[PDB]
Design a protein around this nucleic acid. Structure first.
Ligand SMILES: Nc1ncnc2c1ncn2[C@@H]1O[C@H](COP(=O)(O)O)[C@@H](O)[C@H]1O
Ligand SMILES: NC(=O)CC[C@H](N)C(=O)O
Length: 529
RNA sequence: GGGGUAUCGCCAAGCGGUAAGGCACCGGAUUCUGAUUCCGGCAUUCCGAGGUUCGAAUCCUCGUACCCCAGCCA
């Protein structure tokens, strides 16, 4: 429950509505991000909880900023999150003929006129936050003139910016949005849906309310920056001949620490190549999270936890990571992998090796087990061996022993260094029958793996509020290591996550993982206290 | 000017009956993943100051802080 579901409840009770119909209206000018996910969960979630409908609509009213590539990926992300829209995918452009007719209705009613104030003059005439604007000198043309001039605009008889269609409201309204908002502007640009049939395009405020009404939307849900816009939303519908009047309700947008949730900024990271692309695992895009290894279910859980309110908020990264850990901690099978390898030989071991049984998931025997190869030459993480270290250190210490995960106990007794004095091989002995702790991988059966450790994209909590957000990128958002994985991962399937015991959750693909050299992305590290 | 919001570090219930839950955090117990699991603690107070009431975070008054609006962007 949230303030919006309560409003719906009350409309159902009072009989104002007998069904709920919502919509997710993204503009196809970029990929969807976790913020869109909050909106997707809200609109599609309400629809299914109330046995209603939710449309997927591409608000494609500005051709120069959109692309068919985006509409393609957006349908992909919505589907991946686990939601289905009502009927066919809709497009604002599907209503261009309708919008054009409604503009004509307004003109016929003296509520719209063709203005020829230049793009600079319109602002000079607009007024300020504390001073009323003033009437354009072209504001009182006759119905006939506006009609003729509007057709000229439509026909291509005006250069760009040389004319626009404006609503006739109030140049002195405290709501800046009501100061004769522009309904149409000229743009000789091919539209990804209508090609070159139009050279004039409808503005957002004129388009959105009419699209909602025609679609039968009951509750139009948007973010807080459109609160002022609601007044123009209602003005348009109140002044044209349309049978329903969808009501808008705004909620606060999502903000995540250490990241940016702006398409213009996300686009800049992609265009200047500071990330691989929109689906870079460090990106807060739905596709980037998917490639990072998050589950749609964990994103839905997250959206469920953060709530829906009217308060400005900035969720912490810990909250998101908790959601993915909960999912993976329960379902991700375990495996051995050494990210920072150093050789360790068991001079005590005899033979070419043997096989040891390891649980696919400790706390869950129902997930079965597997046979893993053990030998006298294995790999362990350098960080797990210490010649000295204090008393806390529960790992392998020169002269002390530790349990090899699901295997034997070993005692380090003779280390060996190189030129710069860097250890190159730890010599230990093992107990014939012995079956802290550390993971390991048999060197002879090791699968060479590239491991990509990811971290926060930016080094500050609120990069979006920096003078130059790019100058605050975290140089270690991605750190590539070459390690060794148990042969078992040879059959790892892209997308599917695994828990590399004592390290974290990882998954394949990474767009780079091939047959010869597999690449794994660290979805998220384990809680290391 | 106008439109909005102010409850534990970060989210968020509470809609006049005298403060849910989640994340984070501090303890203890389990555990061959210092993970998980598991019990235990964590705002005598809800931006501030008055008012009304038997009684308020929940109503009124005046303040204070922050967010949004001057694209022919959405
Ligand atoms: N950060 C955000 N948090 C929540 N909802 C958002 C966010 N950004 C955009 N939306 C929603 O997503 C819809 C489409 O976004 P856009 O691609 O900007 O048109 C908007 O109408 C909002 O309802
Ligand atoms: N009323 C709406 O939610 C439309 C929002 C608009 N598509 C955007 O860019 O967020």
């Amino acid at each position: 429950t949230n303030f919006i579901r309560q409003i719906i409840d009350e409309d159902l009770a009072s009989g104002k509505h007998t069904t709920v119909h919502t919509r997710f209206p993204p503009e196809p000018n970029g990929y969807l991000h976790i913020g869109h996910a909050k909106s997707i969960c809200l609109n599609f979630g309400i629809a299914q909880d109330y046995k209603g409908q939710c449309n997927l609509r591409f608000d494609d009213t500005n051709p120069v900023k959109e692309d068919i590539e985006y509409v393609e990926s957006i349908k992909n992300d919505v589907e991946w999150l686990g939601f289905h829209w009502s009927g066919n995918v809709r497009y604002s452009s599907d209503y261009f003929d309708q919008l054009h007719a409604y503009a004509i209705e307004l003109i016929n009613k003296g509520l719209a006129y063709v203005d020829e104030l230049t793009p600079e003059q319109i602002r000079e005439y607009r007024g300020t936050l504390t001073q009323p604007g003033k009437n354009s000198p072209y504001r009182d043309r006759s119905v006939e003139e506006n009609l003729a001039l509007f057709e000229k605009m439509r026909a291509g008889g005006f250069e760009e910016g040389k004319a626009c269609l404006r609503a006739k409201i109030d140049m002195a309204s405290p709501f800046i949005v009501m100061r004769d908002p522009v309904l149409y502007r000229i743009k000789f640009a091919e539209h990804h849906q209508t090609g070159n049939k139009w050279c004039i395009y409808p503005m957002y405020d004129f388009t959105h309310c009419i699209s909602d009404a025609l679609e039968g939307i009951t509750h139009s849900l948007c973010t807080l920056e459109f609160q002022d816009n609601r007044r123009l939303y209602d003005w348009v519908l109140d002044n044209i001949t349309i049978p329903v009047h969808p009501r808008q309700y705004e909620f606060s947008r999502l903000n995540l620490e250490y990241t940016v949730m702006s398409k213009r900024k996300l686009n800049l990271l992609v265009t200047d190549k500071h990330v691989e692309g929109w689906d870079d695992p460090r990106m807060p895009t739905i596709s980037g999270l998917r490639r990072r290894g998050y589950t749609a279910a964990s994103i839905r859980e997250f959206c469920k936890r953060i709530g829906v309110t009217k308060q400005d908020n900035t969720i912490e990264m810990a909250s998101l990571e908790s959601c993915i850990r909960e999912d993976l901690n329960e379902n991700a099978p375990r495996a051995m992998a050494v990210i920072d390898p150093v050789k360790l030989v068991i001079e005590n071991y005899q033979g070419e090796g043997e096989m040891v049984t390891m649980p696919n998931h400790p706390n869950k025997p129902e997930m079965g087990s597997r046979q893993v190869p053990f030998s006298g030459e294995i790999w362990i993480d350098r960080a797990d061996f210490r010649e000295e270290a204090n008393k806390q250190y529960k790992r392998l210490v020169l002269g002390k022993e530790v349990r090899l995960r699901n295997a034997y106990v070993i005692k380090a007794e003779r280390v060996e260094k190189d030129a710069e004095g860097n250890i190159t091989t730890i010599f230990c002995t093992y107990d014939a029958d012995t079956l802290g702790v550390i993971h390991w991988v048999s060197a002879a059966h090791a699968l060479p793996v590239e491991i990509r450790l990811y971290d926060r994209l930016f080094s500050v909590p609120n990069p979006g509020a920096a003078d130059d957000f790019l100058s605050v990128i975290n140089p270690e958002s991605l750190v590539i290591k070459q390690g060794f994985a148990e042969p078992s991962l040879k059959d790892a399937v892209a997308g599917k996550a695994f828990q590399f015991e004592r390290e974290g959750y990882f998954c394949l693909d990474s767009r780079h993982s091939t047959a010869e050299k597999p690449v794994f992305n660290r979805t998220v590290g384990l809680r290391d206290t």
